[PDB]
Design a protein around this ligand. Structure first.
Ligand SMILES: *C(=S)NCc1ccccc1
Ligand SMILES: *C(=S)NCc1ccccc1
Ligand SMILES: *C(=S)NCc1ccccc1
Lengths: 114, 114, 114
């Protein structure tokens, strides 16, 4: 999996270790070794949620398979919890777009995963 | 809907009430309460359109349903309009990727909209 | 084609002419008129790949058709080579998401491409 967070929360409010924690928690959650996992956090965004400039986050999680009803509910609990715990972002001000990618549509190391 | 703008237009060139106007114009456009509308503007971007570095925008609109031929035509007229007027980007230098998301693939509030 | 690269490489390490080279090279590789090609580079990102903060990149390539098995392998080799040459990013620290967009779902010039 690769996971991207865009948030209006200031860089300084992103606690040390947060990328490793994302990397670790997603490894566990998806069942994939941590060497495959990309994580990307973008603070200080100019964004709004429901007209409010209170803290929020717009996210995406890409995965080849392992995408579905129950699984995505389980990810959302997990990631929202992390965003609430570490960045003080309320889960009802979080969106996470989930993408089930086909292996041939994901590039890596001069090729694709197909 | 959620709507993201990425652009090479300077930050000080984005009007103060732009997020709200995006929020409000989209809520009217899509019939969705504003409370659900997320907006996101990313200025000062290193980007080029047609080999050119004059102002441009790369955008996306994610929505659960409410995506398709006429609606997307209408959204583009609406959104290009706003980018034309407020950010003074020409419409033939704007891309807008539309995404019809399944409710099960959008995380919010420790679950999904499924 | 529109191509976006996010990377933890510092802005000063992005060489002069890189966007033009990407436009040019994407134009060559897709045969598509360069006037419609969009490129977008985002340096200094806070990101990790395999748990590591060594140079990496997360990218996307949107296109209306001309997305497929061999083509994507060809794009990956082209694009990873550029990122290796120009930004000194190892190709095994690069993800590229490929998207075959429907024309009805791509907004441009107050309309869509349908
Ligand atoms: C986890 S192993 N992610 C690999 C991946 C999947 C989909 C898109 C990009 C990267
Ligand atoms: C408008 S009600 N957008 C809600 C939404 C749709 C798709 C993805 C994130 C959020
Ligand atoms: C290359 S000609 N890209 C045009 C395009 C396709 C899909 C989405 C945005 C732009």
């Amino acid at each position: 999996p690769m996971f991207i967070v865009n948030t209006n929360v200031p860089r300084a409010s992103v606690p040390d270790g947060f990328l490793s924690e994302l990397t670790q928690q997603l490894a566990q959650a998806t069942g994939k070794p941590p060497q495959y996992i990309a994580v990307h956090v973008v603070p200080d965004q100019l964004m709004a949620f429901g007209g409010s400039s209170e803290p929020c986050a717009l996210c995406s999680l890409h995965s080849i398979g392992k995408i579905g009803g129950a699984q995505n509910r389980s990810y959302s609990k997990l990631l929202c919890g992390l965003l609430a715990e570490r960045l003080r972002i309320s889960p009802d001000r979080v969106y996470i777009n989930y993408y089930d990618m086909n292996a041939a549509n994901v590039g890596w190391n001069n090729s694709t995963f197909a």
